[PDB]
A paper describes a structure:
In order to gain further insight into the nature and sites of the Oxy/X-domain interactions from kistamicin biosynthesis, we were able to obtain crystals of a complex of the OxyAkis protein and X-domain from kistamicin biosynthesis that diffracted to a resolution of 2.6 Å. OxyAkis shows the archetypal P450 fold, which is largely composed of α-helices aside from one region of β-sheets. The active site heme iron is coordinated by the thiolate of the conserved, proximal Cys332 residue, whilst the I-helix that runs across the top of the heme contains the Glu/Gln pair of residues (Glu228, Gln229) that are required in P450 enzymes to maintain an effective protonation cascade during oxygen activation. The closest structural homologue to OxyAkis was identified as the related GPA cyclisation enzyme OxyAtei (RMSD 1.5 Å), which includes the same orientations of the capping F- and G-helices above the active site. The Xkis domain within the OxyAkis complex adopts the typical C-domain fold composed of a pseudo-dimer of chloramphenicol acetyl transferase-like domains. The Xkis domain shows the same mutated active site residues as seen in the Xtei structure, which includes the mutation of crucial histidine and glycine residues (HHxxxDG to HRxxxDE) that render the X-domain inactive for condensation or epimerisation activity as well as blocking the access channel to the active site itself. In terms of the interaction between the two proteins, the Xkis-domain remains closely associated to the PxDD motif at the start of the OxyAkis F-helix, but now the X-domain has rotated in towards the C-terminus of OxyAkis, increasing the number of favourable protein-protein contacts around the OxyAkis D/E helices and connecting loop. Burial of a substantial surface area is observed in both complexes, consistent with the positive binding entropy, with the OxyAkis/Xkis complex displaying a slightly larger buried surface area than the OxyBtei/Xtei complex (976 Å2 vs 725 Å2, respectively).
Second, an oxidative cyclisation cascade consisting typically of three to four cytochrome P450 (Oxy) enzymes (one enzyme per ring formed) is then recruited to the NRPS-bound heptapeptide in order to perform the stepwise cyclisation of the peptide into a rigid, active antibiotic. Here, we show that the three crosslinks that occur during the kistamicin peptide construction are catalysed by only two Oxy enzymes, with the activity of the kistamicin Oxy enzymes being distinct from those found in the biosynthesis of typical Type I-IV GPAs. Despite these differences, the kistamicin Oxy enzymes still rely on recruitment to the peptide bound to the NRPS by interaction with the X-domain, a unique recruitment domain found in GPA biosynthesis.
Residue numbers in the entry:
A (entry chain A): 6 to 35, 39 to 62, 77 to 307, 311 to 384
B (entry chain B): 1040 to 1238, 1257 to 1490
Write the structure that this text describes.
Amino acid sequence: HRVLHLRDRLDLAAELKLLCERGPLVRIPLSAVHWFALGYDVVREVLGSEKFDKPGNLLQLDPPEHTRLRRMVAPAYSVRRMQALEPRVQAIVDDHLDTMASTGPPVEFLREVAGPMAARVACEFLGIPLDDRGELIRLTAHRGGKRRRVLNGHAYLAYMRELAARLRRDPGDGMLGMVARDHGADISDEELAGLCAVVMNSSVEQTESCLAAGTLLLLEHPEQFALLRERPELGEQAVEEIVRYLSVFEGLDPRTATEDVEIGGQVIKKGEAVFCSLLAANRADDGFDITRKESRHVAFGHGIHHCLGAPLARMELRIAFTTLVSRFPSLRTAVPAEEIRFRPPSSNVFTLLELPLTW
Amino acid sequence: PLPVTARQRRMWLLSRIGDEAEGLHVRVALRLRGRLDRDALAGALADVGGRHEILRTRFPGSRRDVRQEILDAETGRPPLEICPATEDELPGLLADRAGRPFDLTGEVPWRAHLFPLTDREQVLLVVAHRIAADEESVDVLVRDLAAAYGARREGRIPERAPLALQFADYALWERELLAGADERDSLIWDQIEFWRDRLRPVLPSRRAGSVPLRLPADSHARLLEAARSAGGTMFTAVHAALAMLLSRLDGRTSVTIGTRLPRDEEQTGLVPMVGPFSRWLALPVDLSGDPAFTEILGRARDVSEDAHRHQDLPFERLAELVVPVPSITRHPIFQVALQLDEDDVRPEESWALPGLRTSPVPMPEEAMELDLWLKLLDHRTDEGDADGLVGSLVYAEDRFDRAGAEALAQRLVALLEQVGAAPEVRLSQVDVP
Ligand code: HEM
């Protein structure tokens, strides 16, 4: 059952490739009977069907509560708003790549470039007081010490209650400003803090993971690294190809079937939880090619729970990847590829442990 | 007329002693690799001072009375020395600048010393007098300096939610719920009565060294085992062991160690602010008769519960009430202190000035009044089982040398291993040569 997260490096491990040969939807009895959705069309079905089920945490919410919170937050990612945010993100990307260059090579790209960049973009998008960003990261990070995590939770909730009061009086820009503007007392400080914390934490983890592993992925295809510098209009396609190839969100939470459904010839009884492997559906048809048009992938999910931050993620990844490849043509890894350590299969996102880069 | 606190009162007095005695300061040295915007660093330093009134607070007065004079951000910004150096001479410069005394009557209680090494590498030292900053304030200092620098390096004023409480509010709160000192059966009166019944060079240097102290998991497990057996913690197990060692070394039937507690974690408003929030707790244990380690573990456990039920009276005020002839060369009530910490995230790993590769520069042990400060890490497996006890015996140089401290550390490790493997051992039949 751990096979869904076994990888070579960025590539599918052999055991997972043998499993995907066994059709795009397999049943597996353990203890209970689980299901693996491994195909693009099969994963779309099990996510787009109304026959499955799973504060401020949209991903663990279900209708009608999921609808109530998704409605208030969704217009924050509008096409016009993301376009208005581009020059700010571009300046943020340029600054971090200035720090990267001035500090000089080598650089630990993940914690010194990618992480700070993702969190700075996420905080400008949220409308967080721009210099309380470090404090909100620190108070909501998952660094252990359960008493400390509870105390940090108490301190962050107190800050958010003061910020929500300030915002509900006279709001401002950012997702938090709009949610406080269009909705007052319709959303609580708890839900406001939950939405904000999901953005600057797990969403930042995925963004920084795409930035780091995406950089490595471009580095290991140098002709496409140069091609993106040569034809920067390929950025949108390159990002769609990168997120498809990386699949940092490898597997999804189980979609327990509320009815007895037959996606294919195999019957799924009510209660047989089906696990979506976006990594398999994206990588089992395949090579990296940023010139591909109309990328066919499920890297941002599907159905009512499809990624709410995909507009910002795509936007930020395009600006970062295209700016990076043109600013560092001689960019390379500072260590041999074998020394590149990847997170052990832990079911919660896929990422590098670190990315030593030089130029 | 803004009052000071009991701790500030004691810190102010001990600050008038001179260069020979190392200043009682907290300090942090940061290695900053990259292009540093010196004028932004100066602005960010002033911004931290503007954010925390106590960092721009001055302490004029005399032996009978000290006052908190809060300056504005500009007049009262911290001084910033720029001292070009080579790595060669950084150890001596950091020690000297960290020890330079403060004139708290006409100076803000912190300062910064920048040491340019190259155009892309500097070392920054921040010193703050303990009248204004405790151990936890150093983390707050660096984090707020990082937040202010990131904004200043972009030609912008720091945009942060201000402090809900200032330390002036804490000083008045202490002057309030404490004013009932002379009133039968009052809250603090009950506590003042509790501690009464419960309880060398003429000029100190306060220089501290440290020797390592390691206990293998085997003996660590047996102490945790005996601690659980008596309803105590690992702190209680080491407290009892240390109380036996000091009892035999000094030949005394009544040993009193202390422990430093941080700011009140319940009062959540104190979380993001700089201040002398260190609370000290005496833990007097009576070893009368000839108690066994299990029995001493009980006495240690019982005094820790009663003491934590009586921690609203500040240690410095209690000192004034039970010390007849106070000494600047021997710490009041206790001279040995014990810290037992569970493993946790290190704040130094998460210090980052935007635009600069930030990493901490080690400094010598902090100046202290204690003779011995045993700081131990209580390592555990994911299940909570003992996984070694690792730490340092911080010793006063005016009182021990490295050999005398190593002999002490080894003597305690032996005692720890003995009482763990035989918790019924009496105080008299314990092995301390
Ligand atoms: C700024 C960046 C991002 C933000 C703000 C963001 C936000 C969110 C939110 C709020 C949800 C839950 C929506 C709901 O349940 O209705 C979600 C789900 C999801 N996100 Fe993102 N996200 C970001 C980046 C990414 C990236 C880079 C990936 C790469 C794989 C990703 C993959 C997913 C997936 C697959 C889901 C659906 C999970 C499931 O259905 O079980 N997201 N995202």
